[PDB]
Amino acid sequence: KSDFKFSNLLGTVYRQGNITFSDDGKQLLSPVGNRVSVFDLINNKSFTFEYEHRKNIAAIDLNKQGTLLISIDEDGRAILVNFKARNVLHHFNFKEKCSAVKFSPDGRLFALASGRFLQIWKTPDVNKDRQFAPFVRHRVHAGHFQDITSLTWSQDSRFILTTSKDLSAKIWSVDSEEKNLAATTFNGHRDYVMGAFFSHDQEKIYTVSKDGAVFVWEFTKRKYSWRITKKHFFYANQAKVKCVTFHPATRLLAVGFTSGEFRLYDLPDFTLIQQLSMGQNPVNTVSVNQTGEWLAFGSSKLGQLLVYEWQSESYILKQQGHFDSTNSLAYSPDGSRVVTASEDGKIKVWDITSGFCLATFEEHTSSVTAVQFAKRGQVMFSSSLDGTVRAWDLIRYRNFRTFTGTERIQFNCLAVDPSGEVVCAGSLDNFDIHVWSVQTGQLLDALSGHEGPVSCLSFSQENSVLASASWDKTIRIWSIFGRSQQVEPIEVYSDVLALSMRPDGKEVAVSTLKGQISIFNIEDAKQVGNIDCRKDIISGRFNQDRFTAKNSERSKFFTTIHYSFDGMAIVAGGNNNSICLYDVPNEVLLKRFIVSRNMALNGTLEFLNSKKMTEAGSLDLIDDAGENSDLEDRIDNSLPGSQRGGDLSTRKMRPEVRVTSVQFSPTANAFAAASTEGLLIYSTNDTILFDPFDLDVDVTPHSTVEALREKQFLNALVMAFRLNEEYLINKVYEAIPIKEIPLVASNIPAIYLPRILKFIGDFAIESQHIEFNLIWIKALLSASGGYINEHKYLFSTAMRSIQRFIVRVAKEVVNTTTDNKYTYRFLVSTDGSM
Amino acid sequence: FIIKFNHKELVSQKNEELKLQINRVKTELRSALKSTEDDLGFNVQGLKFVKQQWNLRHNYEFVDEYDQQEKESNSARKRVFGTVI
Amino acid sequence: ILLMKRCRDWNTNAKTHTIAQRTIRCILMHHNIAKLSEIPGMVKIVDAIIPYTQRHFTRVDNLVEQSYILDYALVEMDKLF
Amino acid sequence: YTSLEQIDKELLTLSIGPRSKMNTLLHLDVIRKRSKPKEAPKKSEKLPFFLQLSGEKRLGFESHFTKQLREGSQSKDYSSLLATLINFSPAAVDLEIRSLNSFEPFDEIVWFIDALTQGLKSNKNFELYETFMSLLFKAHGDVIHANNKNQDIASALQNWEDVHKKEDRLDDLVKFCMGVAAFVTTA
Amino acid sequence: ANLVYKLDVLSSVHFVPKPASTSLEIRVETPTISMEDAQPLYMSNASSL
Amino acid sequence: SRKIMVPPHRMTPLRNSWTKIYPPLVEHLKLQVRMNLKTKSVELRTNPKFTTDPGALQKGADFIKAFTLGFDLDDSIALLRLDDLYIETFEVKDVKTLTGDHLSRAIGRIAGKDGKTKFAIENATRTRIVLADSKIHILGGFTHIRMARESVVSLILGSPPGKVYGNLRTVASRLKERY
Amino acid sequence: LLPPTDPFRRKHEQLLLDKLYAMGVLTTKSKISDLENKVTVSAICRRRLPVIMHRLKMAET
C-alpha cells in the first residue's frame, strides 16, 4: 500500500550529454538531466534508473558486454551501475570536468577525457563484490595543451586517440612497449578539433574539426611517417560542427551542425549520402549503432531525440520532451496513456510502457494550463491562457469545438462532467465559472458569486455537482442540474486551492494556503477531518534567496491534491521539493518522496554551502556566460521579469523545482507527478516485499507446492495469498486445470478477492495466455460479480485493469479473428475471374 | 436496459420458466445479431477488396516515393471547417 | 449499378442498413457473380459506401456485447438457484 | 517462478515476444510512411550503386525459407518452418509473404496454407499465425480469388477453416467477459 | 509577432489574449496512424475524415 | 585453368578495353591470361608466383564472363569486390511463353517507356539487370537476385502496372531496412 | 506609413493599445500618438514590483 518507488521518468527523452546505444541495437540509453533512461526499441518497454546524480550528466558509456554502465557528472562525480542488477556499484569523484567516456571494445579497461589529461583505468569485475576501491588507474597521459574534448578507441584494444581544445590531436598507445609505434602528433586544423577516428583498417585516421575540415592522415612518404593525403571541407558558411561519430565498418561519418543540419559521408570518397534537418536547434549529440545502420541524433535546447536509420530514408522515432513546462496532467481511463500540458501549447499523449509521445497537439498558441479527460477516454479537454477551452478526439486527433468566453479571459483550471455534456473552466481575471455545453459551443451561463479567482474545479462522478476552490477562502458547491440552481458555501481558514474529490463523490479534499489539507462532506457540509502538512515539506532555499529554509514561506503549502481511486489515500504535491502520500482516515503520512536532487534546479537543498558566498555575491549567481568560447550561448536575451516565461534563455536564473499536477493511475497502484524534471512515475509493480495476511506457523512455501501435489487446489491458492508472494501466486495459478477453475473461483473468500483481481489484471497484460486468463475472468465475474457490485470502490482499480486487458490486447485479436474469417468467406464463395 | 436495471430481482427470483425463457431469447437474439453482423463484416471485407483491386489495376502507380506521397495527399479528400485561431 | 447508387443512399442512415447490407450481399452471393466480377466502371462509387458499414459493424458488435448480460443473468441465477 | 510456454494443448496461448509485433505486421506500410521525413532528403547522386553490399569487412539460389517450405511438403511437417517464421523481422516477413514464388502452379501458396493449418493446430503463437494469412490475403488475395474454385486450393483453404472453426471460443469468451465487466463496474 | 512574445515573456506569461477569431482550415483524408510523431506504436486505425 | 569465350555482343567493346581492364586484374590477382583472339576465347590460369587464392581464378573468370555477357567495367570492378554478390543469367523460355508476337509485347512490357521500367526495376530493387532480347543477366545480392527473379516472373505472367509499381516500392523498403 | 483608413490598420493598434493598457505601461486609450510618445522606460519601470508597492503605499520609500 505504501512501498512506492521510482520506476519511470516519462517525458524529457534527452536533455544534455552523450546519447549511446547498447552493443546490440535493442537498448537506447539517453542522458536525462538527472539519470540514465534505458529505452528498448525492439521490445517496446522503457526503464529509468532509480539512482540520482548530483548534477547534470556529462557523458555515458556502456560496456560492450552490456553489464557495466558508467555515468559521469559534469563535475566528475562518476557513478558505476551494475546494468543487469540495476544498482550502484561505486561513487567515484574525478576532480576535474570530464568530457568523453569510452570503454575499450574488449571491455577490460576504459579511457576518460577529463581536463587536459587522458585517464586510463581498469574496469572492475562485475562478479566481484562491492569493494571500497574498485578503480585502479593504468596510466595518465598529459601530453596536451588544452582540454580534451573527444575520445575514440581503436577497433583493436591497444590504441587510443584523443582530440583536444588545442588544435592538435594525439594517438596514445595503452601498452608501454608500443610507445614507439604510435606517438606522433596530428595538427594543422584551423579550429576546434572534436573528433578523430581510425578507419576500418588501423592504417588511416580521419580527423574532423569545427571549421568544417576533414583531414585524412595516411602513413606514407612525401623513414616516412603520417602525411596528409587529402582534405575535405563541408562548406557550411555559418554552421559549425558540434559533434561527430564514425562507424568504421560502414565507413559513415555523421556530422552535427549547430544550424540544425546533419550530413552522412562515405570517407575514402567524401560523398554526401543524406543530409536532413531537424530545425533551429544545434545537433548536440551524435552516436552510431554497433551494426552501423542506426543513428541516434539529439538536440538539447528543445530536448528532442531522433533515431534514424540512414539506409531507408525514414525515421524510427522523432520524440521531443519539454523541460520545465509541463503545467498539468491527465491520465487515461486505461492506465497506459498519460497526456500532459506544456508552456508551448503542446498537448502530448505519452505512453507508459515506452517513454515516447504517441501524438502531439499544437493548436493552442498560448500555454496550456489544465488538461482533463472525460467519457471513457475517447474525448478529452484542455484549457489554455489563449482564451479558449478546446475539446479533442483521440480517435481522429482533432478538435470538435473551441469553446470561448465573451471577451477571451484567461483560464486556470478545467473540469468536466463524467457524462460528456458540460465543460467548465475557471479564471484569474474574470473569476466566474463559465460553463459550456459539449454539443452547442455557446456558453450556457456564468456561475458567479466568488471574490477572487476560482482556482480548481471538479464534477462529482455520482451526484453530478461541481465544487469550486477559490481565493475567497470558500468552497462553493453548485448543484446546476435539474431545477436546483442552488449555491452552498463551505468557508475555510485560508486561501484554498487545488480541490479534489473522491470517486465515491461524497467528499472534497482541499489544500489551504496555510498548509493544512481539509476534507469535507458534500451533502453534509460539516468538516470531517483535516491533516496538517507544514512540517513534512522540504522548502528548498534558492541560491538567490535571502532567508533561511525554515521561515521560507515560498513553498510550504500544497498546490496539488488527488485522491486514490480506492478512496483511501491522498497524494499531495506542491511548489516544494517534496511529494507526500497521506492516508485519509488515519490522519498521518505514509512516506515522503524527494522529487529531484539537482543544484541545476533551484530548491533542492535546505542547507546551502558556505564556501559559495564570498564577501560579495554568491559564487553560482555570478553570470559566467562570458567565459564560454562560442557566440550563441554568450548572447543574453534575458528579460527582467521572466518568471515562468516562454523560454529558458530568458530566465537569467536556474529553473526552480516544483510538481504541479499529480494523478493516481486507475489500474496499477501507481501515481504520476508532472515535475520540473519532467513526469515522474512512482510505482509498486516490482512487488519485492514480504507482505503477509493472517500468517501462521505451518504455512510455508513448501506447504504451497505440497498442496499442489495432493491437488488441494483451493487450499493451495488461498493459502498462497496468505504469503502474498507474486511467484507463489503465479505457481498455483498456472498449474490448476480448466475444469477445476469454476469450483475454485466460486469458493474464494471475500478477503482475497481484491488480491486475485489485482493479480490477474497485472499478470495478464504481458502474458501469452489469453485463453487461460479470460477463463479465469469469466469464472470470477460470474460467480462473485454481486460482491464487486456491492463494493465498487474497493475493486475499481483492479476492475479497470481487467477491462483494460480485454480491450487493449485481447480485443484486437478478436478483431483479427473476425477480419480474417470475413475475408475468407468472401474470397472462397464469391466470383472467379475474367 | 430493463434487465440491466431490474437485475437484482430478475436474478434472485427462482423460476424454471424464467430460466427457460431467457435461454430461448438469449440464444435467438445472439443468432439474429450474428446473422446481421456476418453480413456487415462480409461487406466491409468484400468491398475493401474491390477498392484495393481497382487501386492496383486502374491506378497507374508512381515509383518516386516522396513524389507519390505528395500526389496522394493532393488526390485525397479535403473538407473545410470553421476554426478559431 | 443504379440499384447500388440507391443502396448507397439507404446505407447513410442507421435504420435501413439491414436492407442495404443484404442487397450488397445479394450482389455478391445471390446474383450471377462472375458476371459481376467482369464489369468495371462503378468502383469509384462503391468505395464511398464502406466507412458507413464499419460504423454499423461496430454498433452491432457492441449490441452483441450487450447481449451477453443475459448470459451473466442466466449463470448467476443458476448459481444462486 | 518462470511462466510456462503453454498450460495445456487445448489452450489458445499467444507468441513469446512483444505484444506490438502483431501491430507492426498488420500496419507495416503506414508506420514507415509516417516515419518518413516531410521532404525528400538531398542526395549526391554520384554514389556507388552497391554501397550497401560494400560493407567493409534455380535450386541453389532459392531462399532458406523457400527450401524449408519445399522440405516441409516433403516431410509433411512445418514446425521447423514455423520456428523461423516467428523469429523473422516484420520487414523480412512482408518481403517473405509477398514473394512466395507461387503464381502459375500455386504450389507454395498451398504449402504455406498447410503450414499455417499445422500452426493453428499447435495452438501456440495464435496471434502471429492469424496475422500471417491476413498478410497473405493482403498480398495474394487477388491471386487466390482469380483461381478460386480449384479443387486443390479450395481443399487447403477449407482444411484451414475446419481448424479455425474452433477459434470462436475466445470470441465468445471476450464478448462475455467485458459485457460483464462493463455491467458490474457501472452498476 | 515577436513583440507580443517579448511582451508576454516580460509579463510573467499570464497574459490577456486576442479578442476573437474566425478562420478557415482544410483536412486531408490521411490515415490517422500517420497524424503523429514517429513511433513504433499508435492508437487509431480509421480515417481522419 | 578456365576458358571464357567472348561473344559478338561485346567484341569491339572488349577490344577497346583489351588492356584497360587487363592491367587491373593482373595487379590485384595476376592470372595468366592473354588476348587469344584467334579462337575468340581467353584462357585464364593461376600464375606460378601469384597463386595465393584458389578462388582468384574463379573470380577473374566471373569478371571475364561479366565482360562477355555485357556488364560494364564498373560492374567488373564490383566483380573484383564481390565478397557479397551473385550473377544469375536467367534467359527466356525459363518462364516460357510465345516467342512471336507475345515475346515482342513482353519486350515492350519489360522496357516500358523506352527502358524506363527496366531502369526503375534495377534502381529500386538494387540490382543490375542486363536485359537482352531473350537473356536477363541479373547481378546483385542473394535477396536482390530473388527480388529481381520474382519481379521478372511477375511481368511475364501478367499483372497490372499499378500492382508491380506498388510492389517495387515496398520491396525497395524491405531490403533497405534490416531490423 | 500605412494608409489611415486601412482595415488591417483599423484593427491593429487598438489591439496593441489594449495589450499595453493591460500591461500597465500606458494608461490612456484615447490617443494613439501616446504609443510613440508616452511609451517610456519610466512608464515601464513604474509597473515593476517595488514601485507598485509605493503606489499602493505598502512601503515607506
Distance CA(A328)–CA(A343), nearest Å, equals 10
Which of B74, B77, B80 is most worth mutating to test chain E (most E CB atoms within 10 A of its CB)?
Answer: B77
**Sign of the four-CA dihedral A29, A31, A35, A39:** negative
**Partners of F43 in the β-ladder:** F3
- Count Cβ atoms within 10 A of the Cβ of residue A657 and give its class: 0-12 exposed, 13-18 middle, 19 or more buried: buried
Distance CA(F150)–CA(F168), nearest Å, equals 11
- What resolution in angstroms, rounded to 1 decimal? 4.0
Q: If you compute the radius of gyration of chain B from its CA atoms, what whole number of angstroms results?
A: 26
CA distances (Å), origin A801, targets A476, A672, A809, D10, D14 = 34, 17, 12, 26, 20
Picking from F126, F138, F135, the residue whose alpha carbon sits closest to that of residue F87 is F138
Distance CA(A152)–CA(A148), nearest Å, equals 11
Picking from A167, A236, A168, A163, the residue whose alpha carbon sits closest to that of residue A198 is A163
Q: What is the dihedral of CA F166, F169, F173, F176, to 10 degrees?
A: 150
**Residue A574 three-state SS:** coil
Distance CA(F116)–CA(F128), nearest Å, equals 14
**Residue A302 three-state SS:** coil
CA distances (Å), origin A470, targets A94, A166, A516, D57, D95 = 52, 61, 16, 70, 62
Which chains have 3 or more CB–CB distances shorter than 8 Å to chain C? A, B, D, E
Taking contacts as CB-CB distances below 8 angstroms, the residues of chain F near B65 are 169, 172
**Residue A476 three-state SS:** strand
In Å, how far is C28's CA from the nearest CA of chain E? 25
Give the long-range contacts of residues F73-80, CB within 8 A, separation 24 or more: F73/F17, F73/F20, F73/F21, F74/D49, F75/F128, F75/F139, F76/F21, F77/F24, F78/D49, F78/D50, F78/F139, F80/F24, F80/F25, F80/F28
**Partners of A140 in the β-ladder:** A119
CA distances (Å), origin A512, targets A183, A414, A574 = 69, 19, 12
Picking from A332, A800, C54, A812, the residue whose alpha carbon sits closest to that of residue D178 is A800
All residues at 6 or more sequence positions from A62 whose CB lies less than 8 Å from its CB, including other chains: A20, A22, A23, A29, A68, A69, A83, A103
Which cell is B12 given? 434472485
Residue A431 backbone class (left: φ over 0; alpha: ψ -120 to 50; beta: rest): left
User: Position C50: which residue type?
Assistant: I
All residues at 6 or more sequence positions from D120 whose CB lies less than 8 Å from its CB, including other chains: D126, D129, D160, D163, D164, D167
- Count Cβ atoms within 10 A of the Cβ of residue G37 and give its class: 0-12 exposed, 13-18 middle, 19 or more buried: exposed
Distance CA(F59)–CA(F77), nearest Å, equals 11
CB atoms within 10 A of CB A653: 14
Q: What is the dihedral of CA A89, A95, A100, A101, to 10 degrees?
A: -20
- Count Cβ atoms within 10 A of the Cβ of residue G50 and give its class: 0-12 exposed, 13-18 middle, 19 or more buried: exposed
**Partners of D168 in the β-ladder:** none
Q: Do G23 and E7 touch (CB under 8 A)?
A: yes
**Sign of the four-CA dihedral D85, D20, C58, B53:** negative
Give chain D's length. 187
Distance CA(A398)–CA(G13), nearest Å, equals 33
Distance CA(F9)–CA(F132), nearest Å, equals 10
Which cell is F147 given? 527480388
Distance CA(A371)–CA(A367), nearest Å, equals 11
Closest residue in F to A24 (Cα) is: F179
**Residue D90 three-state SS:** helix
Closest residue in B to F173 (Cα) is: B65
Which cell is A527 given? 468538516
The secondary structure of A481-538 as a DSSP string is SSS--EEEEEE-SS--EEEEE-TTSSEEEEE-TTS-EEEEESSS-SEEEEE--SSS--
Which cell is A693 given? 495476511
DSSP tag of A211? S
Residue A188 backbone class (left: φ over 0; alpha: ψ -120 to 50; beta: rest): left
- Count Cβ atoms within 10 A of the Cβ of residue B31 and give its class: 0-12 exposed, 13-18 middle, 19 or more buried: exposed
Taking contacts as CB-CB distances below 8 angstroms, the residues of chain E near A319 are 37-39
Q: Do B43 and C24 touch (CB under 8 A)?
A: yes
Taking contacts as CB-CB distances below 8 angstroms, the residues of chain C near D179 are 65-69, 71-72
Distance CA(A186)–CA(A205), nearest Å, equals 10
User: Position A574: which residue type?
Assistant: G
Distance CA(F117)–CA(F108), nearest Å, equals 10
Contact A242, A256 (CB under 8 A): yes
In Å, how far is C39's CA from the nearest CA of chain A? 10
Picking from A830, B46, B40, the residue whose alpha carbon sits closest to that of residue C46 is B46
In the PDB record, what is the listed experimental method?
cryo-EM
Distance CA(A753)–CA(A759), nearest Å, equals 10
Q: What is the dihedral of CA F162, F168, F173, F179, to 10 degrees?
A: 120
Contact A396, A353 (CB under 8 A): no
Q: List the Cα angle D133/D139/D140 in 5-degree steps.
A: 85
Do at least 3 CB pairs under 8 Å connect C with B? yes
Picking from C66, C75, B33, B9, the residue whose alpha carbon sits closest to that of residue A778 is C75
Pair type for strands A20-21 and A5-10:
unpaired
Q: Does C69 touch chain B (CB under 8 A)?
A: yes
HSE (CB half, 13 Å, CA atoms) of A633?
A: 13
Which cell is E38 given? 514517429
In Å, how far is E45's CA from the nearest CA of chain G? 43
Q: List the Cα angle B8/B14/B19 in 5-degree steps.
A: 95
Q: List the Cα angle A86/A594/A648 in 5-degree steps.
A: 95
Q: Do F162 and B63 touch (CB under 8 A)?
A: no
DSSP tag of C29? I
Give the long-range contacts of residues D131-134, CB within 8 A, separation 24 or more: D131/A816, D131/D22, D131/D25, D131/D26, D132/D25, D132/D85, D132/D93, D132/D97, D133/A820, D133/D160, D134/A816, D134/A819, D134/A820, D134/A823, D134/D25, D134/D26
- At E23, give phi and psi (nearest 5°): -130, -175
In Å, how far is A808's CA from the nearest CA of chain E? 10
Distance CA(A174)–CA(A192), nearest Å, equals 25
Which chains have 3 or more CB–CB distances shorter than 8 Å to chain D? A, B, C, E, F
Residue whose entry in the numeric block shows the C-alpha cell 560494364: F72
User: Position A84: which residue type?
Assistant: K
HSE (CB half, 13 Å, CA atoms) of A308?
A: 24
Closest residue in A to C32 (Cα) is: A831
**Sign of the four-CA dihedral A185, A189, A190, A191:** negative
Picking from A49, A53, A54, the residue whose alpha carbon sits closest to that of residue A9 is A49
CA distances (Å), origin A168, targets A141, A144, A233, A398, A594 = 15, 8, 18, 55, 45
Contact A499, A467 (CB under 8 A): yes
Do at least 3 CB pairs under 8 Å connect C with G? no
- At A574, give phi and psi (nearest 5°): -150, -160
Pair type for strands A159-164 and A169-173:
antiparallel
Which of A295, A365, A395 is most worth mutating to test chain E (most E CB atoms within 10 A of its CB)?
Answer: A395
HSE (CB half, 13 Å, CA atoms) of D18?
A: 21
User: Position A668: which residue type?
Assistant: A
Q: Do D34 and E40 touch (CB under 8 A)?
A: no
Which cell is A424 given? 467548465
DSSP tag of D41? P
Q: If you compute the radius of gyration of chain C from its CA atoms, what whole number of angstroms results?
A: 19
Q: A125-147: buried (b, 16+ CB within 10 Å) or exposed (e) per residue?
A: eeeeeeeeebbeebeebeebeeb
Distance CA(A365)–CA(A343), nearest Å, equals 9
Contact A303, A14 (CB under 8 A): yes
Q: Does D92 touch chain A (CB under 8 A)?
A: no
Give the long-range contacts of residues F85-88, CB within 8 A, separation 24 or more: F85/D50, F85/D53, F85/F139, F85/F140, F85/F141, F86/D61, F86/F139, F86/F140, F86/F141, F86/F142, F86/F145, F87/F62, F87/F137, F87/F138, F87/F139, F88/D61, F88/F137, F88/F138, F88/F145, F88/F149
DSSP tag of B33? H
CA D165 from chain center: how many Å?
19
Contact A681, A355 (CB under 8 A): no
Closest residue in D to A757 (Cα) is: D181
Distance CA(A730)–CA(A733), nearest Å, equals 5
Q: Do F120 and B68 touch (CB under 8 A)?
A: no
Distance CA(A761)–CA(A7), nearest Å, equals 19
Contact A582, A589 (CB under 8 A): yes
**Residue A207 three-state SS:** strand
All residues at 6 or more sequence positions from A317 whose CB lies less than 8 Å from its CB, including other chains: A41, A305, A306, A307, A356, E37, E38, E39, E40
Picking from A389, A388, A505, the residue whose alpha carbon sits closest to that of residue A458 is A505
**Partners of A404 in the β-ladder:** A388
CA distances (Å), origin A365, targets A320, A430, F26 = 18, 21, 70
Q: A254-273: buried (b, 16+ CB within 10 Å) or exposed (e) per residue?
A: bbbbbbbbbbbbbbeebbbb
Q: Do D20 and E40 touch (CB under 8 A)?
A: yes
Q: Does C26 touch chain A (CB under 8 A)?
A: no
Distance CA(A447)–CA(A478), nearest Å, equals 8
Three-state SS string across A660-703, please?
EEEEECCCCCCEEEEECCCEEEEECCCCCCCCCCCCCCCCCHHH
**Widest distance between CA atoms in chain B:** 71
Picking from E21, C14, B82, the residue whose alpha carbon sits closest to that of residue A400 is B82
Distance CA(C11)–CA(C8), nearest Å, equals 5
Q: What are the residue ranges of helices labelled H in A403-459?
A: none
Name the helix (H) or strand (E) containing A138.
strand A136-141
CA distances (Å), origin A417, targets A66, E41, F140 = 50, 30, 64
Q: Do E28 and B77 touch (CB under 8 A)?
A: yes
Which of E29, E35, E45, E47 is most worth mutating to test chain B (most B CB atoms within 10 A of its CB)?
Answer: E29
Q: Does E32 touch chain A (CB under 8 A)?
A: yes
Do at least 3 CB pairs under 8 Å connect E with A? yes
In Å, how far is G57's CA from the nearest CA of chain E? 23
CA distances (Å), origin G51, targets A645, E14, G24, G57, G59 = 22, 20, 13, 9, 9
Contact A544, A621 (CB under 8 A): yes
Q: Does C81 touch chain D (CB under 8 A)?
A: no
CB atoms within 10 A of CB D171: 15
Picking from A66, C46, D96, A60, the residue whose alpha carbon sits closest to that of residue F143 is D96
Picking from D136, D12, D28, the residue whose alpha carbon sits closest to that of residue D92 is D28
Report the helix count and the strand count for chain B, using DSSP H and E. 4, 1
Ranges assigned E (strand) in chain F = 2-5, 31-32, 41-46, 86-91, 128-131, 135-140
Contact F69, F130 (CB under 8 A): yes
Picking from D158, D144, D134, the residue whose alpha carbon sits closest to that of residue A831 is D144
**Partners of A139 in the β-ladder:** A120
Which cell is D21 given? 509485433
Contact E44, A395 (CB under 8 A): yes
Which of C26, C67, C71, C75 is most worth mutating to test chain B (most B CB atoms within 10 A of its CB)?
Answer: C67
Pair type for strands A388-393 and A329-331:
unpaired
Distance CA(F105)–CA(A350), nearest Å, equals 55
Taking contacts as CB-CB distances below 8 angstroms, the residues of chain C near E46 are 51, 54
Query: For the packed helices D126-139 and D107-122, what is the interaxial angle rounded to 10 degrees?
Result: 160
